[PDB]
Amino acid sequence: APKAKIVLVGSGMIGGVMATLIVQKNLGDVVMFDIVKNMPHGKALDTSHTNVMAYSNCKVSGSNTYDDLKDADVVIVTAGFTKAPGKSDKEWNRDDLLPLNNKIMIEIGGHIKNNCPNAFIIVVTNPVDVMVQLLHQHSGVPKNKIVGLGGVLDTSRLKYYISQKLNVCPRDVNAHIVGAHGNKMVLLKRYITVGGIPLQEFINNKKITDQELDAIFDRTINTALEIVNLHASPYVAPAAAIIEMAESYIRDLRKVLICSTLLEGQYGHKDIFAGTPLVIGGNGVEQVIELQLNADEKKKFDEAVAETSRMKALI
Amino acid sequence: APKAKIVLVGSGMIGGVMATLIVQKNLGDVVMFDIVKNMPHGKALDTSHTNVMAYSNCKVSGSNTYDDLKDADVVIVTAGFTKAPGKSDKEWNRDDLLPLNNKIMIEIGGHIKNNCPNAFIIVVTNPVDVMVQLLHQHSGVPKNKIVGLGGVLDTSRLKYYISQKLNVCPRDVNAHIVGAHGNKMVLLKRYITVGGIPLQEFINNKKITDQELDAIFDRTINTALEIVNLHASPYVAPAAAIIEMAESYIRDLRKVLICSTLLEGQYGHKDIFAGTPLVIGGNGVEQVIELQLNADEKKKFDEAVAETSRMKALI
Amino acid sequence: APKAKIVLVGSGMIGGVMATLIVQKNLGDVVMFDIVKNMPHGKALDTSHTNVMAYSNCKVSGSNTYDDLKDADVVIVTAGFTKAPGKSDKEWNRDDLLPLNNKIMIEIGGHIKNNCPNAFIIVVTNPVDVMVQLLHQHSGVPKNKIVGLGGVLDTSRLKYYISQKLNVCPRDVNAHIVGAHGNKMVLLKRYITVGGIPLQEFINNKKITDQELDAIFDRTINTALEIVNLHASPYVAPAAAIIEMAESYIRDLRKVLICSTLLEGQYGHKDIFAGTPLVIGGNGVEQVIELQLNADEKKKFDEAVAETSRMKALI
Amino acid sequence: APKAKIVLVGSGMIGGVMATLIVQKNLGDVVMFDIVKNMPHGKALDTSHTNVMAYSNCKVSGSNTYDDLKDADVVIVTAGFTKAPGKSDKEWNRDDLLPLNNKIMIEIGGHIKNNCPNAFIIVVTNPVDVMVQLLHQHSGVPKNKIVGLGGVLDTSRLKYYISQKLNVCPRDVNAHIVGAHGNKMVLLKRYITVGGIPLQEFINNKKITDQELDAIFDRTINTALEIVNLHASPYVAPAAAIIEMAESYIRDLRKVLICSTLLEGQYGHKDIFAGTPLVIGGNGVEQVIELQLNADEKKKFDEAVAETSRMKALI
């Protein structure tokens, strides 16, 4: 009956598109929160009018007070920095972001614990796989109520590139990128299908070659960098990805999506967050799916988790 | 710019739902044709009013003249009988339909050749794999411009049942049923994925058993009969399935869908229509996808094709 | 988070389309209830498969027990007869329906009181303005939680016909038909706009004439009869209209819709249900809007209410 | 069948949201064109991935060459400046934009005439009512194939503000703001309706007062300024508005929308563009609607057109 209340903790580039999309889908009431005075109210005022064009009925208001987290059903955290100062577009790496972004999670976690402990939480702030757990530790929310953005966005790239080469509906391509969001992303060739058919079949048929696939792989891992060098840290697709995830929770869709979640033994790991297929429903994370990886694949997973494990010690 | 013109050749149970769905999706102008006097004009009047509730702008008119096929962009043929005089609901079989519906194809084909030779055609009339080729022969349209309903409907059942057992979004289950629509339908266990993951992984995990899967199989094959025995020849899912197909042609979606199409050597067969994955886009059938079947799977394919072959001889 | 639970009390022609539309819009879980054995389980099985084609996640099950009303969020009552034994299609009149459908309301009301006292209820069963108050009396629900189908359906016809004549989007025509659903329906010329512009301006411009408008009026009033005479009691538009209403409650849309509601002094009447603009939101009927009618318009209102009053006495 | 080809001539803030929205609605293939090297390709790459999340199939590519206008079905012109240099947020006025924006139209018109003379054109660049005609003069396209952004955006504000005060679905409020986009906007109190009911009725009922309406009026005329002072020149709602207009053309919706169009006698004016209700269909502007204004209202219209007429002489 009541509309879900959605709090965008951070109203920069991603938060802007997220608000637009939420109204388009009439998904819930929106608070656009930020540290920067004024900006949020303006983005919110602008976004609010689209209610007419979209046949929607969602309030959109800006905020500068953590008090607006009260009674939140969904909280989305994009608070932080894209770049590190003194670095050039070339040297862009998500790693160099522990610097300006670690403290922010501590703060935000405190307020969440006090204002909306029953909310479902999605963390985006880089380096996500580390930040997600930090926020989880400070917010006190249950393990099934917090996830980080990753697979959905990374696979959307791989899915889309394959679809262009094969000339089919992008949604018709399925793929899995697990372990961690970042340069050690694990792309699983064996788990790629097109129209439900193993990719190998298309290679045997010479519709696509192993090399063009490898090319596509490279382009997938380095896409954020390619975009950073062309314009700025990606924000449109990140937005759609997060919202596909939020929507699955709010509408209880029970979609299978690859998100950063807490491992309790899966893949032989514990006390850390890693990307893997999950099911997002109205109870939050309904189920975590463990891919039955082979020897070589496990090795890759292990390496990505170590990269997350290493930065963790950096605080 | 102009709206597509869609002609439903047959306006019974399936035609009724198709028209409703077309207005919902603002998919194109609709002519509801039938030989029964007046009935279609009423269904059409009723349906036209939903343009208001759906924010659409599609005309819906009834017809009793083949003249209305003129300039059609899409023609959907459901004309015929759902079952067979002197027959009980328990002995229901789409095969006893050669009696009831052969001649109708010849008549309709002639008018199509005359009024809309460039239309995309979808045949539903059972037994579909035979009927579609008959309409193909008398209408004269190119092989990439005509398909029969089958896989989309059969897999929706298999996908749905599995999804109930696994507790995931039904769209997240992918599966293939090929060869023929009917009792000899080929259900390919090896081609089933959930969230892009091989079904075998969920069986290994004890999420679903081989036995439960086989039961789901029997259910899938006997679904039409189960519904006939509870109410009547199924028509809501058949309609949605057809519209998914028509929509992919009208909007140039390029979805991979399993439909009855003319085989020119694939799977070792020719001069006959059989169900297989294919791509539907703005040009019609953009590509036929031949599954690289193993020896066991090929055997079953050939048995389904043989049933189609047998009925074809009954002329 | 949880999906709304929707119970269709009656699963004939209108119930069938309602269930289809609910899946299309992923609006909630559906129970298709009826007294006819087996029929609803079949319609429900058929309908459930469309979850795949529609990217939805709504359960659809049949029922023959009032037990399934338990915890319903929305209940829609279509239970009854569409016409009347020994009567011809030409003498069709929603009034001869007191015979056919009074007692059914008492029975249903009792079970509602027992199983789902907090549900939002929509009555369709003709003659609706009488039936809705009967169900209101026996079910015990609050006045803001029960309405009858009428204005939304009647105006969709008037809006559509005008839109055809003027060549505009049907949603761009706005109009009001109040008082009662039936032959005494009050069509208010003064309250007609096109793109927010008074209809009179288009008449002054010679875009439509007074005569054409009056013809459109006769058509609007006699639409059900025209369709009965061509096919059967209308059900596709009635269904879309009901779902528009249910959707505005479930998604908290706060749309202004004309429904049958309990009058407590508005228009000079009380202790009776009559059609008038109202707002449907998450709380149910959020506000009843009383049109500031002139002397001529009031006269007509009173005549419609008197017809409802007369039939009420036939107990 | 084929997808519409849509060229965004200008890829700044508005162009960015427009591309996002087009993919969401699967409305057509997109070229994101601009003078600034690199930026466009990046925004395009980013936007392209959302195809997966949105079930869409639209190509999104960047461009720096006017050659990409070839075969365009829709061209949208946002090319230019928001601000004037040396001016503060306080002194922001759309007038001070003849400066940096006039020449741009000449250029773009030449290419349009040579690359896509059959396209439908929407102009946004401020001051729109002047720029639209300039572009019309240089492009040579027919009067029914070119319009400027105005009413839709300005009314969305008025509609939304009224809806908040009255607590109804924003789409349920209808209003007209004609003459010119800018500080002399003509807000027509007499043409405001809520749920199709004259606003006066709600004032008589004391649901809203004349003063709060006047307040709302002020806020409507100064909204861009309020947003400019809070963040930046509005871009989200502008985007949705333009796209509602584009969509009506591509899907042949025949919606009634207030856009800047060429007057040939209407309201007693000629050889100039002014905002007024129009119908946008697949032939472009199907009809221009002349509001039958009264003496006071005409005076206001005349004043807004003079403001457009004055700036025209400024070149």
Ligand SMILES: NC(=O)c1ccc[n+]([C@@H]2O[C@H](COP(=O)([O-])OP(=O)(O)OC[C@H]3O[C@@H](n4cnc5c(N)ncnc54)[C@H](O)[C@@H]3O)[C@@H](O)[C@H]2O)c1
């Ligand atoms: N997980 C992923 O796949 C992925 C993808 C893209 C970006 N990201 C990350 O997401 C984050 C957001 O990116 P963006 O494009 O929105 O950048 P952005 O700079 O445009 O927006 C971030 C906003 O956070 C605000 N902020 C700072 N402290 C805050 C506080 N504690 N509370 C609320 N807001 C606060 C800043 O004002 C800033 O506007 C970045 O750190 C980026 O690295 C992650």
Ligand SMILES: NC(=O)c1ccc[n+]([C@@H]2O[C@H](COP(=O)([O-])OP(=O)(O)OC[C@H]3O[C@@H](n4cnc5c(N)ncnc54)[C@H](O)[C@@H]3O)[C@@H](O)[C@H]2O)c1
């Ligand atoms: N392909 C599939 O997977 C599948 C699934 C379900 C049903 N079907 C088949 O589709 C057919 C139609 O099903 P339905 O439920 O709509 O049946 P229906 O009986 O309700 O409708 C059939 C309509 O065709 C009409 N008709 C007869 N001859 C005609 C002619 N020459 N031109 C136009 N109309 C004519 C009948 O009057 C009737 O209205 C049946 O044969 C059924 O077996 C196929």
Ligand SMILES: NC(=O)c1ccc[n+]([C@@H]2O[C@H](COP(=O)([O-])OP(=O)(O)OC[C@H]3O[C@@H](n4cnc5c(N)ncnc54)[C@H](O)[C@@H]3O)[C@@H](O)[C@H]2O)c1
């Ligand atoms: N409000 C309106 O504007 C409007 C418009 C059209 C029709 N109607 C009315 O709605 C009613 C239903 O229309 P329909 O076309 O779906 O009719 P229908 O005959 O196809 O369906 C009515 C169903 O109710 C069932 N039924 C009988 N008693 C029942 C009970 N106690 N509990 C549950 N089900 C029971 C019947 O078996 C049947 O399936 C009719 O009275 C019709 O006049 C109203």
Ligand SMILES: NC(=O)c1ccc[n+]([C@@H]2O[C@H](COP(=O)([O-])OP(=O)(O)OC[C@H]3O[C@@H](n4cnc5c(N)ncnc54)[C@H](O)[C@@H]3O)[C@@H](O)[C@H]2O)c1
């Ligand atoms: N009509 C309205 O209701 C309305 C509302 C808002 C904004 N606007 C106007 O729309 C225009 C666009 O606003 P914006 O927010 O997109 O600003 P923006 O600066 O972010 O985008 C404009 C882009 O035009 C580009 N450009 C310059 N010359 C070009 C050329 N000839 N070809 C292609 N691109 C070129 C610039 O690189 C710039 O990025 C502004 O002039 C603004 O005043 C009108």
